[PDB]
Ligand binder design. Structure first.
Ligand SMILES: Nc1c(S(=O)(=O)O)cc(Nc2ccc(Nc3nc(Cl)nc(Nc4ccccc4S(=O)(=O)O)n3)c(S(=O)(=O)O)c2)c2c1C(=O)c1ccccc1C2=O
Ligand SMILES: N[C@@H](CCC(=O)N[C@@H](CS)C(=O)NCC(=O)O)C(=O)O
Ligand SMILES: N[C@@H](CCC(=O)N[C@@H](CS)C(=O)NCC(=O)O)C(=O)O
Ligand SMILES: [Ca+2]
Lengths: 198, 198
């Protein structure tokens, strides 16, 4: 397949896909559109949202659907049907919390206040559940790295921007992030990707 | 296998799993909890949410991850990997929207503002996109029913509680709901299930 990923010039919801491409050493066109392109790009999307990934002329959409598609029949999937279910479940838990944030809120002061409230009053209960879940194991699921680990590194990277001390009580979750960042293909992508806030 | 679904006494986020069990003819315990029993069950769950599904003593969480686990290798999944991705992407498009509603909000003026806004402005855009996406086809993905058609029926049932004219410009979306509801195992479940608002 020829692959064309369309998104904004940010990590955002496309980053999980870009990591999977890096990890599997698969070539693709990382198409990054400008704001001013958006009305034309959007007219061609099935539900008005990006990322989309075109595969031999056919459009796929929804970031986590696409990530799941790309990892099928790979070592990133989950080694059993039960583990595959767990991979999905941790991914959706993270995704649910990410979607609590008002990313598109226009009023700066209110956006801020809600980010701070979410990060102070809500995030600590999820960090604790994730840490307890991981226990002393190496990876979130199974005995090998999966895309759920990628998603945790990706999500916590953005959260750390807004809450530097997020993981101060959670060394185990920091070690996991480090393990993902050290995978040679992933480290290489992290080093080379365009530097964006989000 | 020995299956026990735990959720509130409502369709909500469990209903997709209930349709899949019905359609596959799989017996399970449909455990509906009462509000006063939740805090104590809540504290025993790795991530403090329902639904959960117990499978032979093992606990799964996250309603779409579990729905996916249950339909793997059935005819409710798509017929190729690319179609499975389309099924996933429709399900998440639907979920993204349902999850926009402030189901939990306590401030009644703020909840009622947001509902009316979503239903008046956003929802018609979604209907239009979904109707274009379905075109003249029988089912949303491929040439046979998948759990994405089930999710459309479940989601639209709740939306229609709040906006009965939602589908007045989209006969084909109504017909797609009827197709789902006419499948004998689904029809029998709908007829027999507990009558809740949601
Ligand atoms: N769901 C989102 C969304 S959402 O809009 O779909 O709710 C948004 C979102 N990020 C995300 C962050 C910013 C913007 N866009 C956006 N919007 C405004 Cl009102 N201002 C700016 N300004 C802006 C522009 C460029 C750079 C930085 C900034 S700034 O936010 O720091 O001020 N950008 C947008 S946009 O696509 O809706 O336009 C998505 C994320 C996610 C994620 O789920 C997510 C998951 C894991 C890691 C990261 C993310 C994530 O970043
Ligand atoms: N759950 C979806 C979220 C899709 C989404 O809301 N994408 C944003 C970019 S992060 C978008 O296309 N926003 C532009 C808009 O809604 O107009 C996914 O993972 O792809
Ligand atoms: N995306 C999740 C959402 C899980 C969720 O937030 N469930 C709610 C009820 S719909 C819940 O457990 N709320 C009670 C609580 O969290 O205290 C899923 O599909 O399972
Ligand atoms: Ca979701």
């Amino acid at each position: 397949p020829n692959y064309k990923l369309t998104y904004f010039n940010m990590r955002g919801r496309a980053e999980i896909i870009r990591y999977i491409f890096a990890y599997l050493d698969i070539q693709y066109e990382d198409h990054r559109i400008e704001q001013a392109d958006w009305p034309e790009i959007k007219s061609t999307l099935p539900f008005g949202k990006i990322p989309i990934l075109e595969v031999d002329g056919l459009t796929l959409h929804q970031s986590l659907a696409i990530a799941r598609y790309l990892t099928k029949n790979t070592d990133l999937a989950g080694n059993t049907e039960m583990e595959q279910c767990h991979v999905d479940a941790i991914v959706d838990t993270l995704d649910d919390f990410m979607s609590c944030f008002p990313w598109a809120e226009k009023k700066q002061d209110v956006k801020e206040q809600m980010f701070n409230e979410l990060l102070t009053y809500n995030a600590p209960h999820l960090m604790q559940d994730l840490d307890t879940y991981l226990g002393g194991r190496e990876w979130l699921i199974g005995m090998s790295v999966t895309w759920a680990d990628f998603y945790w590194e990706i999500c916590s990277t953005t959260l750390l921007v807004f809450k530097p001390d997020l993981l101060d009580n959670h060394p185990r979750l920091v070690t996991l992030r480090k393990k993902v960042q050290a995978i040679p293909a992933v480290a290489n992508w992290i080093k080379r990707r365009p530097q964006t806030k989000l």
